[PDB]
Each structure stands twice: as structure tokens, then as C-alpha cells.
């Protein structure tokens, strides 16, 4: 099972490869905002699942599919992202919804 990221604003989908992908300020997500680290978080696709680990002092945020609040993630800990969940690299910007691929 694979995954894509759907920006909450409706922009193009972001394909994720198996394994670990460093995300943040860079070409993959297109983020240029200096408040976002070039090494902001790790995404891991493995065994049909996706998890994220923040690796910067500037935080990441997580919104379960059933809730309606972007909550801050604890640093350097893994959090699984289910299809329909969202995460963000700023409190109110660069938000991405998780989509599953067959």
C-alpha cells in the first residue's frame, strides 16, 4: 500500500516513495517559507503504513480524521498517519491530507 499527500488548499498531489523521505523546505513539497526547516520531519512508508517523526525544534502538527484541531506532535517521536488524517509544518499553513493508493 502506498500514499499520496493532498495539500488542504487543493494543489497538486505529492507522491511518496517507499522508505524514509525528509520533508520540509524543499522541492518535494515546494515549500520556500524560511520558517520551515529544510530538515523539518521524516516520513516513512513501510508495510502499508505511513508515520512521521518531527526532527526540528520548529514543530509539526497532527489532525486525526475524526477531530478538527491541528495538535502539536512531540519531538523526535513517531506518529502514524492514517488515510484521511492531516499534518502540517506550520500551525496554519502547509497542511497535507493523507490519501491511500491500492
Amino acid at each position: 500500500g502506498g500514499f499520496e499527500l493532498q495539500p488542504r488548499d487543493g494543489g497538486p498531489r505529492v507522491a511518496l516513495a517507499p522508505g524514509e523521505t525528509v520533508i520540509g523546505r524543499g522541492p518535494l513539497l515546494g515549500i520556500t517559507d524560511k520558517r520551515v526547516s529544510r530538515r523539518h520531519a521524516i516520513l516513512e512508508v513501510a508495510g502499508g503504513q505511513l508515520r512521521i517523526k518531527p526532527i526540528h525544534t520548529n514543530p509539526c502538527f497532527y489532525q486525526s480524521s475524526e477531530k478538527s484541531q491541528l495538535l502539536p506532535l512531540k519531538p523526535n517521536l513517531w506518529c502514524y498517519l492514517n488515510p484521511g488524517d492531516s499534518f502540517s509544518l506550520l500551525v496554519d499553513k502547509y497542511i497535507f491530507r493523507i490519501l491511500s493508493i491500492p
Partner: peptide, 7 residues
């Protein structure tokens, strides 16, 4: 456009 130090 992705270089430079983080705030």
C-alpha cells in the same frame, strides 16, 4: 529558492 538558514 530552497537554500538559506531557517528562521
Amino acid at each position: 529558492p530552497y537554500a538559506g538558514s531557517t528562521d
